[PDB]
């Protein structure tokens, strides 16, 4: 064994050595459990960073564990390869975004390997591939055929910066997730999955998930965002038909998330649009006056027309108001002035009754002055509403959906804030959509045996539109309905198609007949295991979800749900800065490249670049990442220190969850416990020897010996729980360097302490195995000359956790008076201070003080009073 420390020699020697054992290359292997453990994988978008390194060293610590449980543990990695983000760093380094995306995957891909992450590569899967975007093109086909996916124009989120619309999910902040531009409304036709049709499965499936971190669960939640409501049908008074037709004449309807107040309506409000504003303005020039100019601030007029209150009869005047909009659904609305403050606004303005109909505890209620409590929807109870009386939210909704239906005039209806989902995107580097356009037959689906549409991989986007638009190469066509001319789509779909359904490739990235073979499906169920940023709640994390139940319903799989677990790793943050271009936008520069100027305090005050000194933006900490160009790559941290110094602090430095700050101080620190697990090691081998560890029985170790034990096997308990229950692993790490602590201050230098150190040393290096492979596979093979991935996963030797005690007996003048329990190593006066506090004693000395206490050792004590 060498005594220096040199990860260059030794990492690659452990990497060629699992990668020839095929550890992480796993087929369908019914003699083992199955564990799917997944981390996000990354954009095309430059250089993976440290940061990634932490995401995906947690994931290598979790697999690494379960492969020495026994486990068949798949672990893939690949590329999010298509769309946005590899098309924008393409352009912003002045490459093709295939050439781009294809010299940034081998680059990536290096990166990984060096870090020696136990992947299975045979499963590698590049999205940008038709092998892979065939089948998100076959599925597109499929749904569009049932109306799932559908084309449409309406107004969408326009992003004048990348050029392109995007989906709600994408804006962020009123901006575009990419460009940090501000969003523009514009009215362009788009494709969209119809995901409004699975809101309720998706809402309610949530619940599924106890293992996922409630916060994801919550803004998921939030963004569906479900109100339960009511339609409820006023009839129209029999004076105030005129000019009405079909359900117009009979009844004005409304929506409403407030049925349990539907007694406390005073009004209604209807849109300039609705007909019963028509009939009523056809002879009034001072309604059409109206009608124009609505044709905020919240302007109303009466009508004249009246509607009845189906539950108590009262007659409520009609109103044209400029906040109903014709999308409303109805386009009407009730109004309840007592318990909504906009109601309360309006009808204190036109001096509109306001009539009380819940009641919260003991406030009173002033018709003159709005309350906070008079919108309170979980906190009241019902009041002036007749055999309504006294019931809360939900019991009065129920009662009057009951009522309403009895009568039909109204029944329960749900709204969501959700939206469908536009996927198409005026962008070059996407998958092309399968959709020709025919003068004759329409937008028709490329069939089956047609598919995929190739998308051309040698195009130079010119920064002017969609340069498919201008290549009839690629739009001009023949229709697959009839084989007329016709143009194809020249839209592309948006990058979170290929990340809704990666994880299923991955159980059969070459099935050539469909997007997963179900036989491999069948085996490999759901992920056991997801690890990714929590900025992914609302879009992936959803669409992911919603993708999974259509494949399920189209009968590829048989789960609800893709991912079981889910940790949401913290951010590693570092400095960023930048400057201004003159195209308005930012150019990022990394810190490496950056030289600071500094306070009489130590504050950064400038910033210039090396290479020109001018100066540059300090933009403060912030999230590493590819797209601010702030990352520290960890091919460099690799070559100064080792692969397992980078795995180690991203592990040590804090909790998983919780944001990590960079520092270089923290790599060193790193690095020098590595250099004590191989120093201690080292010395250990120097002083004759492998010898074979210490197992059973352990009467007769000396108490120095037992103690270390004691401390072995506490901390193979500790680590085990911490990878496998509380997945939190800088704590794991610290439970080793206790151990190696107090194995430094025991003398293990005799034959049983030999046994012992040659024990400990053994647990260690498998224990911190999942952490830093490299290191622990090198040290294990110089301690043992077995494989380490077939010794498997320390075992709890459950007798050396018991604590060395005795028991000795208590007389008083002979009598034996009790019993005490002490450590082995007692001293005399413990045992006397002991048995002088053993109840016994005490009791049967009365209150009289000891004359003389005879001690035998460790077998009796005897007070003498
Ligand atoms: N600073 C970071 N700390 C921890 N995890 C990170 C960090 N940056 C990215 N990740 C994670 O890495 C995975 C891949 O993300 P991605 O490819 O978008 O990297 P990125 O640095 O964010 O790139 P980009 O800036 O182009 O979005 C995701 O799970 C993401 O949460
Ligand atoms: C699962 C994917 C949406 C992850 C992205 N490629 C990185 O944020
Ligand atoms: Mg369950
Ligand atoms: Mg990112
Ligand atoms: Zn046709």
Redo the contacts with the bound molecule.
């Keep these: 064994m060498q005594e220096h420390y040199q990860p260059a020699a030794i990492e690659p020697a452990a990497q060629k050595k699992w990668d020839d054992a095929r550890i992480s290359n796993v087929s369908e292997d019914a003699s083992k459990p199955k564990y799917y453990c997944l981390?996000?994988?990354?954009?095309?978008?430059?250089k993976?960073?440290?940061?990634?390194v932490?995401?995906?060293t947690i994931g290598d610590v979790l697999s690494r564990f379960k492969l020495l449980n026994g486990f068949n543990v798949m672990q893939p990695m690949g590329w999010?390869a298509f769309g946005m983000?590899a098309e924008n760093?393409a352009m912003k380094n002045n490459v093709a975004p295939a050439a781009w995306t294809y010299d940034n995957i081998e680059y990536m891909k290096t990166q990984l390997k060096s870090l020696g992450f136990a992947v299975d590569w045979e499963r590698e899967v590049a999205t940008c591939k038709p092998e892979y975007y065939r089948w998100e093109q076959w599925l597109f086909t499929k749904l569009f055929e049932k109306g799932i996916v559908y084309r449409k124009n309406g107004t969408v989120n326009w992003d004048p910066v990348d050029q392109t619309v995007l989906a709600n999910e994408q804006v962020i902040d009123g901006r575009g997730w990419?460009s940090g531009a501000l969003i523009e409304k514009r009215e362009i036709p788009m494709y969209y999955f119809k995901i409004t049709d699975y809101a309720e499965e998706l809402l309610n499936d949530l619940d599924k998930l106890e293992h996922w971190p409630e916060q994801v669960k919550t803004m998921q939640r939030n963004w569906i965002g479900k109100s339960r409501g009511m339609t409820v049908r006023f009839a129209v008074s029999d004076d105030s038909k005129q000019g009405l037709e079909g359900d117009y004449a009979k009844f004005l309807q409304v929506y409403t998330t407030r049925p349990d107040t539907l007694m406390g309506a005073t009004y209604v409000a209807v849109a300039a649009e609705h007909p019963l504003a028509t009939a009523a303005a056809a002879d009034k020039p001072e309604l059409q006056a109206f009608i124009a100019e609505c044709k905020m601030e919240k302007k109303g007029v009466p009508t004249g027309r009246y509607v009845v209150n189906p539950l108590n009869g009262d007659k409520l005047e009609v109103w044209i108001a400029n906040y109903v909009l014709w999308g409303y659904g109805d386009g009407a609305v009730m109004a309840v002035p007592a318990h909504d403050e906009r109601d309360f606004e309006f009808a204190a303005k036109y001096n509109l009754p306001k009539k009380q109909v819940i009641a919260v505890g003991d406030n009173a209620f002033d018709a003159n002055r709005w309350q906070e409590w008079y919108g309170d929807k979980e906190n009241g109870v019902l009041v002036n509403s007749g055999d309504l009386d006294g019931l809360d939210f939900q019991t009065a909704f129920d009662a009057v959906a009951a009522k309403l239906q009895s009568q039909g005039a109204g029944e329960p209806k749900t709204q969501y804030r959700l939206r469908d989902w536009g996927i198409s995107r005026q962008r070059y580097w996407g998958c092309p959509i399968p959709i020709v356009h025919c003068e004759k037959c329409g937008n028709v689906p490329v069939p089956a045996d047609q598919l995929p549409v190739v998308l051309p991989e040698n195009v130079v986007p010119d920064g002017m539109g969609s340069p498919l638009a201008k290549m009839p190469e690629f739009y001009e066509t023949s229709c697959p309905c009839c084989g007329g001319a016709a143009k194809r789509e020249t839209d592309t779909m948006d990058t979170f198609i290929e990340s809704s359904w990666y994880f299923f490739r991955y159980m059969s990235p070459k099935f050539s007949d469909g997007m997963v073979s179900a036989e491999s499906a069948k085996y490999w169920g759901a992920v056991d295991q997801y690890?990714?940023?929590?900025?992914?709640a609302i879009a992936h994390l959803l669409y992911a979800r919603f993708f999974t139940k259509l494949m399920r319903d189209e009968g590829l799989v048989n789960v609800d749900e893709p991912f079981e677990r889910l940790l949401?790793?913290?951010?590693?943050?570092?400095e960023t800065y930048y400057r201004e271009n003159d195209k308005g936008g930012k150019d990022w520069i990394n810190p490496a490249d950056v030289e600071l100027t500094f306070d009489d305090k130590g504050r950064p005050v400038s910033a210039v670049l090396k290479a020109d000194g001018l100066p540059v933006v300090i933009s403060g900490t912030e999230?590493?990442?590819?797209?601010?160009n702030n990352?520290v790559d960890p091919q460099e941290l690799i070559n100064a220190y080792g692969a397992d110094t980078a795995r180690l602090f991203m592990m040590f430095a804090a909790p998983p969850e919780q944001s990590?700050e960079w520092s270089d101080s923290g790599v060193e620190g790193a690095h020098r416990f590595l250099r004590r697990l191989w120093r201690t090691v080292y010395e250990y081998l120097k002083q004759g020897g492998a010898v074979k560890a210490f197992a059973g029985n352990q009467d007769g170790l000396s108490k120095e010996l037992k103690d270390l034990r004691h401390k072995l096997h506490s901390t193979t308990a500790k680590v085990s729980d911490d990878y496998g229950r509380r997945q939190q692993f800088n704590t794991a790490i610290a439970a080793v360097m206790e151990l190696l602590n107090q194995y430094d201050k025991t003398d293990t230098g005799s034959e049983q302490g030999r046994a012992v150190a040659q024990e400990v040393l053994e647990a260690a290096v498998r224990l911190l195995w999942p952490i830093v492979p490299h290191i622990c596979e090198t040290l294990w093979s110089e301690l043992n000359g077995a494989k380490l991935w077939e010794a498997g996963w320390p075992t709890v030797d459950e007798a050396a956790l018991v604590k060395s005690e005795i028991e000795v007996m208590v007389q008083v003048n002979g009598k034996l008076r009790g019993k005490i329990t002490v450590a082995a190593d007692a001293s005399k006066a413990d045992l006397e201070a002991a048995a002088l506090a053993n109840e016994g004693a005490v009791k049967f000395m009365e209150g009289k003080p000891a004359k003389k206490i005879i001690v035998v050792p460790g077998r009796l004590v005897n007070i003498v009073v």
């Design positions: 981390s996000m994988f990354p954009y095309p978008s430059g993976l960073h440290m940061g990634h932490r995401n995906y999010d983000p760093a990419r690890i990714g940023g929590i900025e992914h949401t790793q913290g951010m590693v943050v570092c999230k590493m990442s590819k797209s601010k990352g990590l």
